[PDB]
Paper text:
[name] (SGIV), one of the nucleocytoviricota viruses (NCVs), is a highly pathogenic iridovirid. Here, we report the cryo-EM structure of the SGIV capsid at 3.5 Å resolution using a block-based reconstruction method. The cryo-EM map, combined with viral proteomics, crosslinking mass spectrometry (CXMS) and fluorescence colocalization assays, enables us to identify the [name] (MCP) and seven types of minor capsid proteins (mCPs). The atomic models for an asymmetric unit (ASU) of the viral capsid constituted by different copies of these capsid proteins are further determined.
In one ASU, there are 41 MCP capsomers, of which six are in the pentasymmetron, and the other 35 are in the trisymmetron. Similar to PBCV-137, the structural alignment analysis revealed that the N-terminal residues of the SGIV MCPs are conformationally diverse and can be grouped into three configurations (NI, NII and NIII). NI displays a hook-like shape, NII is perpendicular to the capsid surface, and NIII is parallel to the bottom of the capsid. Based on the information from the cryo-EM map and proteomics of the purified SGIV sample, the penton protein was ultimately determined to correspond to the VP14 protein, which is a polypeptide encoded by the orf14 gene and harbors eight potential β-strands. Each VP14 protomer contacts two MCP protomers from two adjacent pseudo-hexameric capsomers. However, the AA sequences and structures of these zip proteins have not been identified except for that of PBCV-137. Using the method described above for the SGIV penton protein, the SGIV zip protein was identified as the [name] protein encoded by the orf38 gene. The atomic model of [name] (P1) shows that two [name] protomers are interlocked into a dimer, which may contribute to gluing two antiparallel MCP capsomers together. The space generated by these missing residues is occupied by another mCP (P2) [name]. The TmP (P3) of SGIV corresponds to the [name] protein encoded by the orf137 gene. [name], encoded by the orf88 gene, was identified as the anchor protein (P5) of SGIV.
Author numbering:
A (entry chain t3): 73 to 169
B (entry chain s1): 76 to 170
C (entry chain t2): 75 to 114
D (entry chain e3): 362 to 463
E (entry chain e3): 53 to 309
F (entry chain e1): 8 to 52
G (entry chain e2): 2 to 463
Amino acid sequence: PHWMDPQLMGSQTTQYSRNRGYGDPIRGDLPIVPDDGGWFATRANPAHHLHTGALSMIGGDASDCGSTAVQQLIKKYEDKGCNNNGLNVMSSHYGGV
Amino acid sequence: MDPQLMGSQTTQYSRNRGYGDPIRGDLPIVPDDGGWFATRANPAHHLHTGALSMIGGDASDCGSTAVQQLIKKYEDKGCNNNGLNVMSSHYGGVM
Amino acid sequence: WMDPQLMGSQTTQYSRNRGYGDPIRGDLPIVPDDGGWFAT
Amino acid sequence: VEYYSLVQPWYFSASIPVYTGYHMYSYALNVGSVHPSGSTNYGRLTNASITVTMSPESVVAAAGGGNNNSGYNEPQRFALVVIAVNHNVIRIMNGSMGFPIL
Amino acid sequence: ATRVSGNPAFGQEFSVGVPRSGDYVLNAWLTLKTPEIKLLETNRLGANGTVRWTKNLMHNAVEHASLTFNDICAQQFNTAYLDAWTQFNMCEGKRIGYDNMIGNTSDMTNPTPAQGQDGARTLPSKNLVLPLPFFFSRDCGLALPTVVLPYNEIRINIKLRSLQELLVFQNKDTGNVIPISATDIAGGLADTVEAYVYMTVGLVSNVERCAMAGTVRDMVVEQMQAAPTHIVNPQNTNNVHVDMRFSHAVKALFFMV
Amino acid sequence: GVTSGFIDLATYDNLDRALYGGKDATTYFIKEHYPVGWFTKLPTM
Amino acid sequence: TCTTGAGVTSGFIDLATYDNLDRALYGGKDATTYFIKEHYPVGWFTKLPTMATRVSGNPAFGQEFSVGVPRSGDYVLNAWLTLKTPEIKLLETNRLGANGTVRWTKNLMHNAVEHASLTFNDICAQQFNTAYLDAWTQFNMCEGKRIGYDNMIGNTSDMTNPTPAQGQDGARTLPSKNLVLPLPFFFSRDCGLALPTVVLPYNEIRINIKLRSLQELLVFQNKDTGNVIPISATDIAGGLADTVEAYVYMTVGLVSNVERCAMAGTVRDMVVEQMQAAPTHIVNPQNTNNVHVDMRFSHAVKALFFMVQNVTYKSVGSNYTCVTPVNGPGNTVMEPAMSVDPIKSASLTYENTTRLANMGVEYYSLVQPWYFSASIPVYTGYHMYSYALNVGSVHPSGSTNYGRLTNASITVTMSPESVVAAAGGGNNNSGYNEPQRFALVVIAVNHNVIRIMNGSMGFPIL
């Protein structure tokens, strides 16, 4: 039952450096391993030097959802084979490169 | 007329596709059928696929879930002798 | 109490749609629409 | 008329109007409640009517001849309006919206 | 909101679509900027003529406001229903705010004499907001699954009223009202009006946003039914019988002459 | 737009997990409905 | 039939109307019914008021006094401060002479009560001031209690009525009546959140209140030109009473012995709401028409209350209008010819990502309070933006934590009325006769978690 327990009882969240602000809010910072040494080797901490981005929750394409279930549904549903009353249409792919 | 009949044309999206979310694609919904007040909408030109494929994708190297291991591995963690027991912020994202 | 009120049984009452029917000869016997989508 | 004007809003509403008119009769315990309360559907009911008896002030103001800055300097006309509020059910499935009861 | 049908003008009807990219739309309000009114010395009533905005500038000039899906008439509200609802279900504390935000500021309803008279006050020009009462705006638990409804087209149609009946032209002596004319006021009557529709959307985490997909959902909503108006002549008769006809489970009946 | 919505959705931490989140966390925009009794009322002298 | 006075058959035809649509709403074996209220037992408890013993000096205007919270109870759930105003007697020998009036400032309480803080041992857990008090009382005010609150805190049309000198027609004495201000705290927000004095035997609970000097509480107006100058001891008879008597009354509760020892020795987590104020920023509409303020907050903010406060005269307070009030007819204060909020439009930016565009001032003034609050302010100013569905609800709703958020900024566009009132040139009794100055204030309300264990409190997340 010491005095001033509340100040020393608990924990505080990590505080980020001013460099973290420049990171892309949507796309997380690229994972780059820091270097060490005694010659101009900055030992910056990625924990408060990297930005995780906003993609972590929105992305994932687990089973349904995302940009794969809709891809499969569109590919299955859109019709193929001749045109008859028309001039033929090709299937446009929405994949990445 | 041979050059005209040669080849095809790109798909024609309906005006409803322009109201969708451009960043993240809208949810895949199977259209209903029937002869009573049922619309046979075509998802191919009625849905928006979003942009979660060109910039998105959980790559082996890139990805927030790939930076997570780096952050945890290089985090000091434990209890320190010169601070106030800094707590590990957890990103996750499970609602 | 409540015996006079709950002893009886009221007669059926028809909707206003029946008032437009043919009095001399009745309407044709047709089954009604049943379903969970725009079904009366 | 004071019944609909004051007594009904006192019990089955969240407020009482501050102007003349606006007569209410509610079958539900709370008008503003989204959750359904007591109500009678008029589709199964046969024809229903409302009888209204008007005040002598209206009949003596319908004819003109009033002096200046009295409001009824000219003949006055009236029109009765009736509004009801009802519940309904909406079903969402297969990316479509529609009533399941029609 | 991206307007795609017509243009906002007094006396015309314009439609606005409800876009996706939200998850649950739960609030909609129409903002409209009133013009500048300046009485002229050439009015027919001359000195004995005053011009003032009508009572409930908003809740007027907005009638037959409808919400529809695809091409089916879904729900509608009008002036009398708006007045009854805002007179009966008004929450105290917000009453002053509403009676200041829908007009009725005692600066637009105060008569203004002509230019040559002692009172040369002009009717101020400002913008007013009317929150559209819809089933989704009634409660936070009722919201449109916009992502789950990609195969429809939600439309909101607003039909404004002409500027002729929005301005009361009173006579200072006999208390008579006559229709306004373009030459009565300076600058004419601007038929075009400046107005927009704003909506509030909600965003949710994907893990449940697309876990709620592919399901059937049921909602309970409230609509109105307005009987056609009946002309009443107290001179001939004192008692009037009016027969109604409604369909669904009526909750309450509002009436007034 | 919705980029700002994504930005302030991405702000998630331990306090946010303590307050919101969880598999059993009841969400808004979805109101459960339960049946009530069937009754009627009318004034009487 | 008959439909006599005691008629009941008319409802049977209404009951008969039940087919295919009311089956979904009513009916069912599991359907609940009205007219049968379920009764459940509750706890056994009593409550009574209790004086709080002073610990640091005596109350005095312009000074700070501290009072220790009375322990040995079971739960503390109300606290309020009562203070008796002095007696004001104008003198004909005042500096302003005949053309001079003295009156109490608008909102006498919420002024001379600032930096009201609650401390556990030697660490602060909550602190509020004038701006937060005004915003909260204008946005979360239950109707019917407005007149009572006005009588409690001043502006009762009697304290703030200008009084001319003794030799003039108006020689009324300003009454010396006691005023009561409830203290909004996390334990006072709801009865569910109450301080466990039985579970806190080791911590010491203290409340610090700092008053304001009497010089900056009396409006010394000029009768004709509407000029405000600081008051002096020789201006009024009897001098200035620097020392005043003030009491803090606190309500404590008691619980049954069965539950007093049942919950002893447990780890408890409580969710509370607190405030945090951005540093003031002087606004000069003459140079630039836009003003940007950086918001640097930490925890899960719930709403942001902002306004622009006229700061021309220190004597006048709670004036968020471009023109200061002046004396009017009938020895009553009246609003000047023009009285509008200096804010025209505002926007929010998240590091070059504008979350909220250049929306009009009427949005924050009317649309936001009408949807996500319990009341709409009746005075000009007091704009808000709430991330939560209901501000007044203690239960957490939608919110964002600024700790992981980058530098956020708020931008405001000035108004033509403010930019013309900033310079002088106003005529007599126009209010803006002298040049006007404005300042911008930003308030944030956020959530936090407090843990009780081992007979002590603390913040597990800091």
